[PDB]
């Protein structure tokens, strides 16, 4: 209980400080992974060889919505195709509609109606933070054992 209270106070602390809010339940990760995949294909302004490694970053952002449904026993491939079908109908219309994963029912959901929101400051340092940590692990070719 003490861990839940201290985590709740620090989560609301960033709500009053930062005026920006992001929806949770995988709404930010699914939209970002789909946007980055179709952005570089249309623009083609990076490189031909670099887009190979960029695809690995886009596919690595879909593990969070697949993890939430994995603990509940739901098929991660079923819930992934249902969200993509809703995002395709949202791209045709010029309006703005957000889609998110509903863990209770198993289908998609509107994160604004359900009320699942995540802090902007937490998710802003989550992408940049996990980038530098995972990159440094790939830069070590050989393990160095010394000092004794």
């Amino acid at each position: 209980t003490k861990d839940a209270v201290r985590d709740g106070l620090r989560a609301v602390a960033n709500v009053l400080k930062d005026k920006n809010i992001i929806p949770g339940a995988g709404a930010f990760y699914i939209a970002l992974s789909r946007y980055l995949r179709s952005a570089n294909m249309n623009k083609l302004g990076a490189k031909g060889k670099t887009k190979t490694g960029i695809e690995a970053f886009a596919e690595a952002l879909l593990v969070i919505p697949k993890t939430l449904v994995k603990n509940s026993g739901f098929d991660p491939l079923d819930v992934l195709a249902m969200v993509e079908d809703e995002l395709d109908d949202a791209q045709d219309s010029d309006e703005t509609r957000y889609v998110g994963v509903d863990l209770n029912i198993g289908d998609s959901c509107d994160p604004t109606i359900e009320g699942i929101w995540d802090s902007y400051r937490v998710l802003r340092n989550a992408i940049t933070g996990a980038t530098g940590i995972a990159s440094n692990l790939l830069l070590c070719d050989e393990l160095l054992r010394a000092g004794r």
């Binding site: 209980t1 861990d3 839940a4 209270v5 985590d7 709740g8 106070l9 989560a11 609301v12 009053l16």
Partner: peptide, 27 residues
């Protein structure tokens, strides 16, 4: 934030407590 660390039965109890905790101390 509450539903993650508990069984979700305690969230309904701590919902008015945590919400009114920050708003009362912070003008």
């Amino acid at each position: 934030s509450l539903l993650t660390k508990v069984d979700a039965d305690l969230t309904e109890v701590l919902t008015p407590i945590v919400t009114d905790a920050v708003l009362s101390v912070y003008d």
